[PDB]
Enzyme design. Structure first.
Site, PDB file in Angstrom:
ATOM      1  N   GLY A 122       0.778  -1.217   0.000  1.00  0.00           N
ATOM      2  CA  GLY A 122       0.000   0.000   0.000  1.00  0.00           C
ATOM      3  C   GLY A 122       0.813   1.272   0.000  1.00  0.00           C
ATOM      4  N   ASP A 204       0.714   2.473 -10.456  1.00  0.00           N
ATOM      5  CA  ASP A 204       2.166   2.380 -10.357  1.00  0.00           C
ATOM      6  C   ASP A 204       2.688   1.153 -11.100  1.00  0.00           C
ATOM      7  OD1 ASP A 204       4.367   3.828  -9.450  1.00  0.00           O
ATOM      8  OD2 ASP A 204       4.638   2.548  -7.684  1.00  0.00           O
ATOM      9  N   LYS A 239       2.271   5.963 -13.477  1.00  0.00           N
ATOM     10  CA  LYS A 239       3.707   5.756 -13.592  1.00  0.00           C
ATOM     11  C   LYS A 239       4.061   5.416 -15.032  1.00  0.00           C
ATOM     12  CE  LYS A 239       6.654   2.588 -11.277  1.00  0.00           C
ATOM     13  NZ  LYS A 239       7.498   1.363 -11.379  1.00  0.00           N
TER      14      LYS A 239
HETATM   15  N1  LIG Z   1      -0.215  -6.505 -15.877  1.00  0.00           N
HETATM   16  C1  LIG Z   1      -0.343  -6.060 -14.633  1.00  0.00           C
HETATM   17  N2  LIG Z   1      -1.582  -5.798 -14.167  1.00  0.00           N
HETATM   18  C2  LIG Z   1      -1.712  -5.347 -12.916  1.00  0.00           C
HETATM   19  N3  LIG Z   1      -0.782  -5.108 -12.004  1.00  0.00           N
HETATM   20  C3  LIG Z   1       0.435  -5.370 -12.497  1.00  0.00           C
HETATM   21  C4  LIG Z   1       0.736  -5.834 -13.758  1.00  0.00           C
HETATM   22  N4  LIG Z   1       2.106  -5.993 -13.898  1.00  0.00           N
HETATM   23  C5  LIG Z   1       2.595  -5.630 -12.740  1.00  0.00           C
HETATM   24  N5  LIG Z   1       1.632  -5.235 -11.850  1.00  0.00           N
HETATM   25  C6  LIG Z   1       1.816  -4.795 -10.478  1.00  0.00           C
HETATM   26  O1  LIG Z   1       2.295  -3.478 -10.481  1.00  0.00           O
HETATM   27  C7  LIG Z   1       3.047  -3.260  -9.268  1.00  0.00           C
HETATM   28  C8  LIG Z   1       4.352  -2.634  -9.639  1.00  0.00           C
HETATM   29  C9  LIG Z   1       4.922  -1.678  -8.605  1.00  0.00           C
HETATM   30  N6  LIG Z   1       5.544  -0.513  -9.307  1.00  0.00           N
HETATM   31  C10 LIG Z   1       3.837  -1.178  -7.663  1.00  0.00           C
HETATM   32  C11 LIG Z   1       4.384  -0.621  -6.379  1.00  0.00           C
HETATM   33  C12 LIG Z   1       3.355  -0.146  -5.347  1.00  0.00           C
HETATM   34  N7  LIG Z   1       2.750   1.151  -5.751  1.00  0.00           N
HETATM   35  C13 LIG Z   1       3.989   0.007  -3.956  1.00  0.00           C
HETATM   36  O2  LIG Z   1       3.450   0.769  -3.183  1.00  0.00           O
HETATM   37  O3  LIG Z   1       5.019  -0.645  -3.708  1.00  0.00           O
HETATM   38  C14 LIG Z   1       3.187  -4.621  -8.587  1.00  0.00           C
HETATM   39  O4  LIG Z   1       2.274  -4.744  -7.508  1.00  0.00           O
HETATM   40  C15 LIG Z   1       2.859  -5.598  -9.716  1.00  0.00           C
HETATM   41  O5  LIG Z   1       2.336  -6.823  -9.256  1.00  0.00           O
END
Ligand SMILES: Nc1ncnc2c1ncn2[C@@H]1O[C@H](C[C@@H](N)CC[C@H](N)C(=O)O)[C@@H](O)[C@H]1O
Length: 390
Positions: A122, A204, A239
């Protein structure tokens, strides 16, 4: 020597884009405007500087020393733990810092009814929860979230099923949260809208020469999910990376038909050495038409990187986007990449001394951040319910 003792804190980078008064026309292929060769030249140059690190990656010894040098020049290293203890913050990843810096800088009209996509930890959610209860004082903060099913390192998904919109494989029957699937994207928005007003959408999502090209479908879906669910007057945070591909620019052209304000931001908490950028849209002016929804969801359904609009109709915007690319990637990122290699050549065998040299500056930089993005202790009654420890 002197090039280490004159390093100054970076500044929050924020580039305004023009909104397009003309009617949006989703394309059904066209000749690119000449300004796209300028964007292509920027992609070649940035990959040239990024390539300067390839020799060190071939032997596991020099590859190790490189990642220590980069660790050493991360001026924000100790800040996450400082923020966590001092102010009772939760899931203080780097994304927490980035989200908090964005909320304190972009001056949103509302951060109260949030849909965070591609999230899982989160970091963004916790930051908004922290910002809302300590700064905005919304009576209650209601949020929904989704992510490709794990990972949930802090038990935020496990402890709040009501808020998460993706499904475990036990229900394969089914939205696994994959935003590259058009069916999932439409379903995610539908469930999200079933949170009545949605004021803040954030995504993100992210998976080196082809980092933007490899994330195009991911970033397309993460944007479509928001644009299908963000209410009028709402705010969007996405992002992205280099923003040099024509498809990416056409997607920014779409954003600029639905938001009063549009900015390419680069927070200081975001690594100056990486291409990561955040597209911030403020005050959603209008919603999709039923046609716009169908065309765009179909473009995701059978994805190819042909531009979504006629880029020649967006010269003003494309020049502003290049100014962002110039400022964020060609100036800042290249300077820091060059700076990291200079540190490697002079301190590969003296990691402790470089950390000694920069320890005073790291405190200055982080003290600056805490002064610019004021923090207050989060009361326990407003902490997110977590199911896991680290
Ligand atoms: N195709 C996809 N659909 C949905 N979520 C995805 C996909 N590919 C990657 N993700 C997710 O995107 C996120 C990537 C990160 N940059 C997110 C970080 C998050 N905002 C944090 O607070 O740490 C991860 O949770 C991945 O599992």
């Amino acid at each position: 020597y002197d090039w280490l003792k004159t390093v100054e804190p970076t500044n929050f980078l924020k580039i305004g884009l023009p909104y397009q008064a003309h009617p949006l026309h989703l394309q059904h292929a066209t000749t690119p405007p000449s300004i796209l060769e300028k964007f292509k030249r920027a992609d070649i140059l940035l990959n040239e500087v990024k390539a300067e690190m390839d020799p060190l990656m071939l032997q596991p010894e020099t590859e190790k020393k490189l990642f220590q040098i980069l660790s050493s020049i991360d001026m924000f290293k100790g800040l996450r733990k400082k923020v966590e203890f001092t102010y009772n913050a939760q899931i203080v990843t780097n994304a927490w810092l980035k989200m908090y810096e964005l909320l304190n800088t972009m001056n949103f009209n509302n951060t109260s009814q949030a849909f965070c996509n591609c999230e899982l930890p989160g970091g963004f959610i916790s930051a908004i929860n922290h910002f809302n209860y300590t700064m905005m004082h919304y009576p209650t903060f209601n949020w929904v979230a989704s992510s490709l099913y794990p990972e949930d390192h802090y038990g935020l998904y496990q402890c709040n099923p009501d808020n998460w919109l993706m499904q475990s494989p036990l229900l394969k029957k089914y939205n696994n949260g994959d935003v590259t699937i058009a069916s999932n994207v439409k379903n995610l928005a539908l469930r999200a809208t079933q949170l009545t007003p949605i004021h803040l959408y954030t995504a993100d999502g992210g998976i080196y020469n082809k980092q933007e090209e490899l994330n195009l479908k991911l970033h397309f879906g993460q944007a479509l999910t928001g644009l299908l669910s963000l209410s009028k007057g709402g705010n969007m945070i996405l992002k992205h990376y280099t923003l040099n591909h024509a498809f990416t620019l056409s997607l920014i052209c779409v954003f600029s038909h639905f938001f009063e304000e549009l900015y390419i931001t680069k927070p200081t908490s975001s690594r100056p050495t990486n291409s990561e950028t955040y597209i911030v849209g403020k005050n959603r002016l209008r919603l999709f038409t039923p046609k716009e929804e169908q065309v765009l969801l179909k473009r995701l359904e059978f994805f190819n990187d042909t531009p979504l609009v006629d880029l020649s109709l967006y010269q003003n915007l494309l020049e502003s986007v290049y100014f962002a690319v110039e400022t964020i990637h060609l100036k800042q990122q290249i300077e820091f990449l060059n700076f990291g290699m200079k540190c490697y050549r002079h301190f590969y065998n003296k990691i402790k001394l470089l950390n000694d040299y920069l320890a005073p500056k790291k405190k200055i930089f982080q003290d600056r951040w805490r002064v610019l993005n004021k923090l207050y202790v989060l009361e326990k009654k407003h902490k997110l319910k977590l199911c896991a420890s680290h």
